[PDB]
Curated annotation (Swiss-Prot), chain A:
Record gene name: CGAS
Modified-residue entries (5-glutamyl glutamate), positions: 146
Modified residues ((Microbial infection) Deamidated glutamine): 276, 279
Site annotation Important for preferential detection of curved long DNA: residues: 27, 35
Annotated 2',3'-cGAMP binding sites: 60, 151, 194, 201
Site (Cleavage): 151-152
Upper taxonomic lineage: Eukaryota, Metazoa, Chordata, Craniata, Vertebrata
Species annotation: Homo sapiens
Annotated residues for binding of Zn(2+): 215, 221-222, 229
Result when mutating residue 14 to N: Strongly reduces enzyme activity and stimulation of interferon production
Outcome of substituting residue 257 to T: Found in patients with uterine endometrioid carcinoma; reduced nucleotidyltransferase activity
Full protein name: Cyclic GMP-AMP synthase
Subcellular location: Nucleus; Chromosome; Cell membrane; Cytoplasm, Cytosol
E.C. number: 2.7.7.86
Mutagenesis or variant effect for residue 239 to R: Reduced enzyme activity. Decreased ubiquitination and SQSTM1-mediated autophagic degradation
Length: 346, 347
């Protein structure tokens, strides 16, 4: 039961050296790209975010870009996507991407993509290739040595206050404090050239890393033997549940629209519903994991999974995931839950 | 006469080491399960209650589970079955077995059973197997070494006042005192996932049944010295044994298979209420005391009425539970055995 989950966690720990070595490779590439990018006038002042691992051998890196004070205009009533313009009119090196007053996502995403392709080639160090993951992605993906993939995402940084669609987001007040929510909302936010064109959408993955690492009601959660909670183990288990299922439905790829981010997002909502560290005692691993699985289910059947930061933005909208894929994954997860997770067997 | 019953008690003493070893096996198994269960979030706080030996090779164990303050709602007008809900609306790990406000018996019984099934298999200690006894049973039954069976019953514990259906039950005042009944009624009561409707639980008072059996005299020192040896325990043994011997003689059509030692125990407690003095149970008067027990059991069969000692409006001999034929059949055999100095105790 709970002893089964621990066996899965032990199993996952085995490929910890294998995912570190892959990461060593990813770092070298990133740093190299980071230097050439600074030689471009538009991209000097580029840097690495978080000051990484979605799945085994799938890596995620963000390139922050310090940008002059930004005027945001909300596209349609999509609560996440925005037109970008400047609030100065002496002109700056991003003017080659302006169209009117609007900063072109796609034009900047196109040169960003171009510079990387340029650096890929003269590299005789290794075999790296460009590939496009899916339309829409603000990420440029690389394949390192035909086994490791890296999502490299361009990100504009805005130090001004978070937009109004985030007002009721980040409901961490009863879990982490109200004052932590204030401290976090003083931090920058990011805009990535994901269109849904000339649109950018909000990204808060730096806060995501932060609430994951600093995750307890107690400031000393997981800093001593008396406060070992199972939040991280539960997210590990959720991600792994999804990946196993995605592989078992490899024939017709019914589940290929779901990702670790849906899982991570739902896990954050569960932390909000269960704000006490006593609710994540490692002795209750089986039950805590069950709490995460039941909430993910309710999300699938209700077809509603709200962005943690942007509550009116539903990640499970029919516009993103078809109604059939959701009903299908509900059936699967329901079954696995009703039978003590056969996908975690042997 | 009285010597024939004594011979039977002596014969039964011969298999005292044989059932003690079997009980030793049962304990080891139960204690093993008790630890694995405490690793589960919903079942930590589980323990052993204390009734142990229903039959010569049938064992009965209860697993108590401390539960926060319990709201009961009586199902239909059944005086024994109840819905279980919490008076909390912070919630405890039984929250995964909820449906609305109601605590599901079947949902909790199914994880209990499922946890047990898991420990049984990887056990290389012996051949232990799962079996379901009968429809309705709140028990998970095990078979040890293909000879010994153990009823393991989950039981919620409530430290609140006994429900109203019990108000006229436990009529022990003239036998054990009015003050003993007050003491016992301050003790917890239990709910077992015996369903009527798979979300119901019914009441259990077997801990109280043990207490009045062991502590059974009007005199506090009954059976603590040579001057006070009563035959209460002996009469219940003979009664159980009578039922078991008969159930074996009708091995053919299984005519008596609705009856169990619990009816006999239930009926013996009524006879105690009727004979409250230790002098009505002198060991010299064994044949006569034993007759009192058999006539009353007959009257119950013939009147088709055997009320639960704790819940008087709950009739165990109702046509709803045992058919009218089976009762009339057992009345015949018992009438015959009583009329002929109990031939089933011969040789
Ligand atoms: N590496 C990377 N960083 C991103 O920010 C991101 N956003 C999208 N994608 C990938 O682009 C494609 C377009 O999907 P879309 O945007 O419509 O919905 C996305 C997106 O709205 C949301 N999502 C993913 N990452 C983030 C994120 N960091 N912040 C907010 N939302 C996100 O959850 C959906 C599923 O994402 P993925 O299935 O894991 O991959 C997507 C997809 O392949 C991303 N890939
Ligand atoms: N180990 C165990 N503990 C129980 O509480 C219990 N309750 C029922 N059963 C078994 O489930 C089945 C359903 O019988 P039912 O409920 O209709 O009538 C039962 C029930 O009304 C009552 N009875 C037996 N044990 C108890 C008990 N501990 N408390 C109250 N009543 C009981 O007398 C009848 C005959 O019981 P059994 O024929 O020996 O075993 C029963 C039966 O196999 C039990 N088995
Ligand atoms: Zn912690
Ligand atoms: Zn006595």
């Amino acid at each position: 039961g709970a002893s089964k989950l621990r066996a899965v966690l032990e199993k996952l720990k085995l490929s910890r050296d294998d995912i570190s070595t892959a990461a060593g490779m990813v770092k070298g590439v990133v740093d190299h790209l980071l230097l050439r990018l600074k030689c471009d006038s538009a991209f000097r002042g580029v840097g690495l975010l978080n000051t990484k691992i979605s799945a085994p051998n799938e890596f995620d890196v963000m390139f922050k870009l310090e940008v002059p004070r930004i005027q945001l205009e909300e596209y349609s009533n999509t609560r996440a996507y925005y037109f970008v313009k400047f609030k100065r009119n002496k002109e700056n090196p991003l003017s080659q991407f302006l169209e009117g007053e609007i900063l072109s996502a796609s034009k900047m995403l196109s040169k960003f993509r171009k510079i990387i392709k340029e650096e890929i080639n003269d590299i005789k160090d290794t075999d790296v290739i460009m590939k496009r993951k899916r339309g829409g992605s603000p990420a440029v993906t690389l394949l390192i040595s035909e086994k490791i993939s890296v999502d490299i995402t361009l990100a504009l940084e805005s130090k001004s206050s978070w937009p109004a669609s985030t007002q009721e987001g980040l409901r961490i007040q009863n879990w982490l404090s109200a004052k932590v929510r204030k401290q976090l909302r003083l931090k920058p936010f990011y805009l990535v050239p994901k269109h849904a064109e000339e649109t950018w959408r909000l990204s808060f993955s730096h806060i995501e890393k932060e609430i994951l690492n600093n995750h307890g009601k107690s400031k000393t959660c997981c800093e001593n033997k008396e406060e070992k909670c199972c939040r991280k183990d539960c997210l590990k288990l959720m991600k792994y549940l999804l990946e196993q299922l995605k592989e078992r439905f490899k024939d017709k790829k019914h589940l290929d629209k779901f990702s670790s981010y849906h899982v991570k997002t739902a896990f954050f909502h569960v932390c909000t519903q269960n704000p006490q560290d006593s609710q994540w005692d490692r002795k209750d691993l089986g039950l805590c994991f069950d709490n995460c699985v039941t909430y993910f289910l309710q999300c699938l059947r209700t077809e509603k999974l709200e962005n943690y930061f942007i509550p009116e933005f539903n990640l499970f909208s029919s516009n993103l995931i078809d109604k059939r894929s959701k009903e299908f994954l509900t059936k699967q997860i329901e079954y696995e839950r009703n039978n003590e997770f056969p996908v975690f067997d042997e």
